[PDB]
Amino acid sequence: MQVSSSFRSFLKLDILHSYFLNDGEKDFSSMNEEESKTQLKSYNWKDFLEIYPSQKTSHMMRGNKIFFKSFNDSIILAIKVESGTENQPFNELYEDESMTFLLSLKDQYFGNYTDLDLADQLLYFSNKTPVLPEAFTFKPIDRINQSGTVGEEYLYEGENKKHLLEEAHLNPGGGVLGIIQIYMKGDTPVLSLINNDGTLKNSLPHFKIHFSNRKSTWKYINLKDDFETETKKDYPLTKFGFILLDKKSDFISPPAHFEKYVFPNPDARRIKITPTKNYSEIFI
Amino acid sequence: TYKTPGVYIEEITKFPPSVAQVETAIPAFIGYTQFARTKPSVDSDDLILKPKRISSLLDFTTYYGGAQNEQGITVKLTDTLIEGAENRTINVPEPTFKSPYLMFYSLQMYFANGGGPCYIVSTGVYDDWSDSETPPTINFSDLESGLAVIRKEDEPTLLLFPDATNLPTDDEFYSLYNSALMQCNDLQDRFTILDTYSDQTYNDGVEDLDPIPALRNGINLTKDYLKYGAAYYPFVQTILNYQYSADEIVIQHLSYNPNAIATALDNLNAVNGPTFIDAILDDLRNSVKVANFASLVESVLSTLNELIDAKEEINKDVNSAIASSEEDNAIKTAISDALDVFNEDFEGADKIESVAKNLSDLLIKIKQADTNTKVENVLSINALNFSAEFEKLLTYDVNTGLTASVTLDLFANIGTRLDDIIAAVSAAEPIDVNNGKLNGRLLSDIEPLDNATYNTILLEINSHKVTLPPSSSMAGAYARVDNDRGVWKSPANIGLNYVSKPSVTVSHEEQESMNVHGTGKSVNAIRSFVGKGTLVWGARTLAGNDNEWRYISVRRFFNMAEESIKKATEQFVFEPNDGNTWVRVRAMIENFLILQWRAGALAGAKPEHAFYVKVGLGQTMTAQDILEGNMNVEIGLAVVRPAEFIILKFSHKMQ
Amino acid sequence: HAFYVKVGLGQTMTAQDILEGNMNVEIGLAVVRPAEFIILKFSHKMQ
Amino acid sequence: YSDQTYNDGVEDLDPIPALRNGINLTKDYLKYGAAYYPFVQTILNYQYSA
Amino acid sequence: EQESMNVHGTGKSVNAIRSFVGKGTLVWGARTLAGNDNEWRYISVRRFFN
């Protein structure tokens, strides 16, 4: 009794966040190839985010022979195909089948450094327009070659939120950041996984989610000398970069003996958030 | 429901429920149901072609419904005279036209024989009969759709089709089974249970065919497919009854002294008068305020209910006149038309019946309105419907102290219409020839007329039992063996539950050609043994001459082992192909096989004699496999074989 | 399986709560419900 | 208020229906109490002096 | 009679005191004045939470 199998890539998703990837003012999105590789070597999305399938999704994936693999910057799904070929799924797929994955957070400081107003809202991504009880606008999960970051366009509240959580059949303990839903056939050919005859596409679909970082005014407090000073413009919070402040002109009301002082960059553990400016307090 | 806390007492008749079982081999059942819904309280058939897991018969019935009522039950009463004495014959034959929907009955047998949790695929719902002698059909395309659907499920191991034998041709029957065997070979982990088309010589429209020889010609696949299934013969007689309703069974009554019309006509003459409907029609045509109002509403409601009951009595007698007027169909039409028109005042055309219903619901609400507000006691009349419903009886009675302005009214069109019915019925008095008093009546309506005849008929109806193909019982029997002894034990010498007897008798000199045959297409037998009852005798596959795969237990053991091993190797789909992987893969597989050996599945003094596993460069792989990305795993197993023949030799002792 | 308790920044609180001086505590409980109606069904034994 | 029909000076009221109309609060309040019916006859005497 | 005390369109349930043969006077029923509430209709649930 001989038994054989063959597996091929089905879908790729790119998971990024500026807090870990940018270097001070330098934007990851504008880096060259060597610079990009260098930053990626220190990044692992699992440091802050947890991703897993719903119970129904797991059941379906077993039935259709779909597997879930992960890498420090991405997720790849793979599917069993017929022996002798590259593009015919072993089991027939239908247009309205879908997979649902849930997002949750492990990093307690996510909300301090991530520039997104998540208060009382659900974050939702998909490749097909939903049917919800109240009027809303919709944009799909962005493709790998598109610009932009996660914003308010992906947030839901009230009845629309309630509806989506119920359809996904979520656990009473909640703790969900958001929901990702991918359909075999989406709202346009470039967002679909399969062709009209069920054949896998000949160009792997490649989607992206990218979070932006928060900026703030830095305030320096010197208790022994009894003086306070602030910077003139906001600077970004990053994990690994460094901004050098060394001119009197950089500050509002700089100290008499500025030349003898050193001004450290702030952490993202404590921050004041207001409707206008954000502030970071640093003690000398 | 129930409102008062406490203990309630009810009296019912049914079979006791079975004891729930533990998961074992899981069958799938593909066929027709009555509801197919996800939420019992709504009417949407959302489960069509959506496989669902069921733990017990009780769960089946809350999503899928029960059996279809049989429409083929005939009851005939003949009244004659013997030397001037009355003589009545009651005849209730076995139905010749049966409903082709066996899913419910098959599941009862499955659970009775020890089955556990299973999958149900509903391919559609039951159709109505076209006539008393024209039953619903089975659509081949629906069964193929269900088979395609089950291909995507992981858990099922056995495939069954409860109504394959009710399919219009033998050619369609055989085609469906060939597809199931092909599915099993494509997947390499399922087994098919097969039935013959019929246990009796059946006519294909050209020739008379023997059922065992016909199956052998029908299933025309090679050994690669035949090794994945087995067949059983004959069908069995069970202890289950037919489902029916007394309200659907019409009595034929013939008599030496006809009186069907005369009786109906006399009853109608009583109907068309003041003691039946004129009195009704003449009468029909803030907490204290609510109490007074509620009393007045109840009075009207009671009066309407009497008028409604009157309609029902009329239909019951007129219909016997119609049924009995066999000759002169012109009169049957005249009677029918008169009745059809009468009914329009009560039916949806102008529905007196819904007015009465609505007033009852409104009456409860107004009495309860006092619970919390003066507002409710207003809304119930002017926001809600009390005003609107009374209007449907008299459009504007309120116009004057004496009811007036009846622009429309639901009352008293009855007078003329009753006259039309009677006149039409009376036309049949010189037409009837041989129909007696009970002709055309329902069983449920004759008990008050004659409960001796009624009780006798019911006893005769319930003497008829259900007959089924043996396949759902066998899935049950497989489950018992797998749990008590293990999958490596042959599924034979097992008694069956709820079986009276096999449909036909097979002797030991007949079974020889079922067990051993030149084609290898063995058939297992169901046989009766003295002091034991009905047993499964034989356990071979459809590739019976195969030295390796002829036994069912060997094939099933291997399918089980493959499922577990496959899961063990799938964990490495995108892992590095190197020594660290090869070692982990081997260790996982060997631990599984050691446990199977410890439990007695495999032969051998020590694991070293029971099995082997080989994985790795230089053993199963070369440089070319490393380059391509292949991983090759080789496994061998020592599997135990059964005894079939015991020979006893006798002689005299010498001394 | 009986209960859960959640307290803390990132679970029940945000930066705004730290600033205001709030503490948010979330609790869930699995509570047992009574039977009210007992129904006894009788029939003749078949044999 | 009473287990017998009682007269409010205008109309004769049934005690269970009257309580239902009397307590006119929403669920937020109703969830904090319960009512029992009827009154009971005990074995205690009246206090008096000869 | 108890049926309309226990279940009612307004949710304003009333518990009953009843006499049983061989047992004497028993408290029969334990619901709150928000009897149609899937979460708070029972007295023991409300009291446990308090």
Cβ neighbours, 10 Å, residue B338: 19
Tell me which residue of B297, B470, B457, B318 sits closest to B385, measured CA to CA. Answer: B297
* Start-to-end CA span in chain A (Å): 76
CB distance D30 to E34 below 8 Å = yes
Interface contact B372-D13, CB threshold 8 A: no
Give the span between the Cα atoms of B455 and B619, in whole angstroms: 80
Q: Please list the residues that pair with B396 across neighbouring strands.
A: none
Distances, alpha carbon C44 to alpha carbons B13, B14, B451, E31, in Å: 7, 9, 22, 37
Phi, psi of A98 (to 5 degrees): -155, 160
Give the span between the Cα atoms of B501 and B517, in whole angstroms: 26
Q: Which residues from C are below 8 Å from E42, CB to CB?
A: 33-34
| Burial of B265 (C-beta count, 10 Å sphere; 0-12/13-18/19+) | middle
Q: Which residues from B are below 8 Å from A1, CB to CB?
A: 188, 558
Interface contact A108-C14, CB threshold 8 A: no
Give the span between the Cα atoms of B375 and B363, in whole angstroms: 16
SS3 content of chain D, % helix, strand, coil (to 5): 25, 10, 65
Tell me which residue of B210, D19, B569 sits closest to E15, measured CA to CA. Answer: D19
CB distance B537 to B270 below 8 Å = no
Give the span between the Cα atoms of B588 and A51, in whole angstroms: 28
Which candidate from B153, B188, B573 shows the least CB-CB separation from A63?
Answer: B153
DSSP annotation of B545 reads: T
- For residue A256 the two structure tokens come to 């008499």
DSSP annotation of B278 reads: I
Interface contact C43-B5, CB threshold 8 A: no
Which candidate from B151, B154, B573 shows the least CB-CB separation from A7?
Answer: B573
Run of H or E including B322: helix B287-324
Give the span between the Cα atoms of B462 and B92, in whole angstroms: 10
User: How far does B381 lie from chain E, in Å, by closest CA?
Assistant: 18
Residues 6 or more apart in contact with residue A158 via CB below 8 angstroms: A134
Give the span between the Cα atoms of B522 and B516, in whole angstroms: 6
Taking every pair of Cα atoms in chain A, the longest distance, rounded to a whole number of angstroms, is 88
CB distance B54 to B116 below 8 Å = no
Give the span between the Cα atoms of B154 and B131, in whole angstroms: 42
Q: Which residues from C are below 8 Å from E16, CB to CB?
A: none
Interface contact A173-C10, CB threshold 8 A: no
Tell me which residue of C33, C31, C27 sits closest to C7, measured CA to CA. Answer: C27
Q: Looking at chain B, which residue has its C-alpha nearest residue A91? A: B152
**Which is it for strands B524-529 and B229-233: parallel, antiparallel or unpaired?**
parallel
Interface contact B371-D17, CB threshold 8 A: yes
CB distance B387 to B380 below 8 Å = no
Tell me which residue of B24, B30, B469 sits closest to B231, measured CA to CA. Answer: B469
The dihedral through the CA atoms of D32, D38, D42, D46 has a sign that is positive
CB distance B290 to B378 below 8 Å = no
Which candidate from E3, E6, E9 shows the least CB-CB separation from B368?
Answer: E9
Give the span between the Cα atoms of B407 and B399, in whole angstroms: 11
Q: Is the peptide bond before B136 cis (omega within 30 degrees of 0)?
A: no
* Start-to-end CA span in chain D (Å): 32
Run of H or E including B206: none
CA dihedral of residues A154, A157, A159, A163 (deg, nearest 10): 50
Residue B608 sits at the vertex; the CA angle it makes with B606 and B613, to the nearest 5 degrees, is: 140
The strand ranges marked E within B430-539 are 467-468, 499-502, 524-529, 533-537
Is A3 part of the contact surface with chain B (CB cutoff 8 Å)? yes
CB distance A136 to A160 below 8 Å = yes
**Which is it for strands C25-29 and C3-7: parallel, antiparallel or unpaired?**
antiparallel
Give the span between the Cα atoms of B315 and B334, in whole angstroms: 14
Q: Looking at chain B, which residue has its C-alpha nearest residue D12? A: B288
- Three-state SS string across chain A, please? CCCCCCEEEEEEEEEEEHHHHCECCECHHHCCHHHHHHHHCCCCHHHCEEEEECHHHHHHHHHHCEEEEEECCEEEEEEEECCCCCCCECCCCCCCCEEEEEEEECCCCHHHHECCCCCCCEEEEECCCCCCCCCCCCCCCCECCCCCCCCHHHEECHHHHHHHHHHCCCCCCCCCCEEEEEECCCCCHHHCCECCCCCECCCCCEEEEEECECEEEEEEEECCCCEEEEECCCEECCCCCCCCCCCHHHEECCCCCHHHCCCCCCCCCCCEECCCCEEEEEEC
Q: Please list the residues that pair with A222 across neighbouring strands.
A: A227
Q: Looking at chain B, which residue has its C-alpha nearest residue D13? A: B287
Give the span between the Cα atoms of D15 and D1, in whole angstroms: 7
Q: Which residues from B are below 8 Å from E2, CB to CB?
A: 3-5
The dihedral through the CA atoms of B231, B235, B241, B243 has a sign that is positive
Which candidate from C37, C38, C41 shows the least CB-CB separation from B12?
Answer: C41
The strand ranges marked E within B482-532 are 499-502, 524-529
Tell me which residue of B54, B27, B26, B29 sits closest to B162, measured CA to CA. Answer: B29
Q: Which residues from B are below 8 Å from D29, CB to CB?
A: none
Interface contact B372-D11, CB threshold 8 A: no
Q: Which residue is it, tokens 């004699």?
A: B609
Tell me which residue of B393, B590, B559 sits closest to B488, measured CA to CA. Answer: B559
D8-18 burial string, b = 16+ CB within 10 Å, else e? Answer: eeeeebebbeb
Touch of D by A (3+ CB pairs closer than 8 Å): no
**Which is it for strands A98-105 and B467-468: parallel, antiparallel or unpaired?**
unpaired
B520-541 burial string, b = 16+ CB within 10 Å, else e? Answer: bbbbbbbbeeeeeebbbbbbbb
Q: Looking at chain B, which residue has its C-alpha nearest residue E31? A: B5
User: How far does B590 lie from chain A, in Å, by closest CA?
Assistant: 19
Tell me which residue of B74, B184, B216 sits closest to B133, measured CA to CA. Answer: B74
Give the span between the Cα atoms of A193 and A197, in whole angstroms: 12
CB distance B457 to B93 below 8 Å = no
Is A112 part of the contact surface with chain C (CB cutoff 8 Å)? yes
Q: Which amino acid, one-letter code, is at B9?
A: I
CB distance B335 to B318 below 8 Å = yes
CB distance A179 to A122 below 8 Å = yes
Which candidate from E7, E10, E29 shows the least CB-CB separation from B372?
Answer: E10
Which candidate from E42, E48, E49 shows the least CB-CB separation from C34?
Answer: E42
Q: Is the peptide bond before B234 cis (omega within 30 degrees of 0)?
A: yes
User: How far does C34 lie from chain A, in Å, by closest CA?
Assistant: 23
Cβ neighbours, 10 Å, residue B220: 10
| Burial of A15 (C-beta count, 10 Å sphere; 0-12/13-18/19+) | buried
Distances, alpha carbon B65 to alpha carbons A143, B36, B40, B60, B210, in Å: 48, 8, 10, 7, 36
Distances, alpha carbon B242 to alpha carbons B73, B447, B464, B498, in Å: 10, 21, 7, 15
CA dihedral of residues B587, B588, B594, B595 (deg, nearest 10): 150
* Start-to-end CA span in chain E (Å): 32
Half-sphere exposure at residue E20, Cβ-oriented, CA atoms within 13 angstroms: 9
Tell me which residue of A67, A215, A108 sits closest to B571, measured CA to CA. Answer: A67
Q: Which amino acid, one-letter code, is at B582?
A: W
Tell me which residue of B213, B190, B98 sits closest to B468, measured CA to CA. Answer: B98
SS3 content of chain C, % helix, strand, coil (to 5): 15, 40, 50
Give the span between the Cα atoms of B390 and B252, in whole angstroms: 44
Q: Which residues from A are below 8 Å from B183, CB to CB?
A: none
Neighbours of chain E (3+ CB pairs under 8 A): B, C, D
Q: Which residue is it, tokens 């034989």?
A: B538
Half-sphere exposure at residue B173, Cβ-oriented, CA atoms within 13 angstroms: 21
Residue B535 sits at the vertex; the CA angle it makes with C45 and B104, to the nearest 5 degrees, is: 55
Q: Which residues from D are below 8 Å from E11, CB to CB?
A: 27, 30
Give the span between the Cα atoms of B432 and A26, in whole angstroms: 105
Q: Which residues from E are below 8 Å from B5, CB to CB?
A: 2, 6, 28-29
CB distance A184 to A192 below 8 Å = yes
Give the span between the Cα atoms of A210 and A16, in whole angstroms: 5
Give the span between the Cα atoms of B235 and B501, in whole angstroms: 9
- Counted residue by residue, chain E has a size of 50
Give the span between the Cα atoms of B152 and B150, in whole angstroms: 5
Q: Which amino acid, one-letter code, is at B492?
A: A
Interface contact A69-B573, CB threshold 8 A: yes
Q: Looking at chain A, which residue has its C-alpha nearest residue C4? A: A173
Give the span between the Cα atoms of B501 and B239, in whole angstroms: 10
Ramachandran sector of residue B212 (left: φ over 0; alpha: ψ -120 to 50; beta: rest): alpha
**Which is it for strands A206-211 and A7-17: parallel, antiparallel or unpaired?**
parallel
Give the span between the Cα atoms of D50 and A105, in whole angstroms: 83
Q: Looking at chain D, which residue has its C-alpha nearest residue E9? A: D20
| Burial of D39 (C-beta count, 10 Å sphere; 0-12/13-18/19+) | exposed
Q: Which residues from A are below 8 Å from B562, CB to CB?
A: 3
B432-461 burial string, b = 16+ CB within 10 Å, else e? Answer: bebbbbbbbbbbeebeeeeeebbeebbeeb
Tell me which residue of B223, B208, B216 sits closest to B547, measured CA to CA. Answer: B223
Determine the 3-state secondary structure of D6 from DSSP: strand
Q: Which residues from E are below 8 Å from D30, CB to CB?
A: 11-12, 32-34
CB distance A161 to A134 below 8 Å = no
Half-sphere exposure at residue B502, Cβ-oriented, CA atoms within 13 angstroms: 20
A204-236 burial string, b = 16+ CB within 10 Å, else e? Answer: ebebbbbbbbbebbbbbeeeeeebebebeeebb
CB distance A218 to A130 below 8 Å = no
Give the span between the Cα atoms of B390 and B376, in whole angstroms: 19
User: How far does A148 lie from chain B, in Å, by closest CA?
Assistant: 32
Half-sphere exposure at residue A225, Cβ-oriented, CA atoms within 13 angstroms: 15
Tell me which residue of B151, B196, B142 sits closest to B51, measured CA to CA. Answer: B151
Give the span between the Cα atoms of E50 and E44, in whole angstroms: 10
Give the span between the Cα atoms of B362 and B165, in whole angstroms: 53
Residues 6 or more apart in contact with residue B514 via CB below 8 angstroms: B212, B233, B506, B522, B523, B524, B525, B538
CB distance A16 to A44 below 8 Å = no
- For residue B201 the two structure tokens come to 């010589």
**Which is it for strands A122-126 and A178-183: parallel, antiparallel or unpaired?**
parallel
Picking from B2, B4, B7, B364 by the largest number of E CB atoms within 10 A of its own CB, the best residue to mutate is B4
Give the span between the Cα atoms of B160 and B254, in whole angstroms: 47
SS3 content of chain E, % helix, strand, coil (to 5): 20, 25, 50
Residues 6 or more apart in contact with residue B127 via CB below 8 angstroms: B136, B137
Phi, psi of B63 (to 5 degrees): -120, -30
Q: Looking at chain C, which residue has its C-alpha nearest residue A107? A: C10
The dihedral through the CA atoms of B51, B53, B57, B60 has a sign that is negative
**Which is it for strands B633-637 and B611-615: parallel, antiparallel or unpaired?**
antiparallel
Neighbours of chain B (3+ CB pairs under 8 A): A, C, D, E
Half-sphere exposure at residue B44, Cβ-oriented, CA atoms within 13 angstroms: 5
- Counted residue by residue, chain B has a size of 655
Tell me which residue of B603, B604, B584, B608 sits closest to B642, measured CA to CA. Answer: B603
Phi, psi of B641 (to 5 degrees): -115, 145
Residue E9 sits at the vertex; the CA angle it makes with E3 and E12, to the nearest 5 degrees, is: 75
- For residue E37 the two structure tokens come to 């509430």
Experimental structure resolution, Å: 2.5
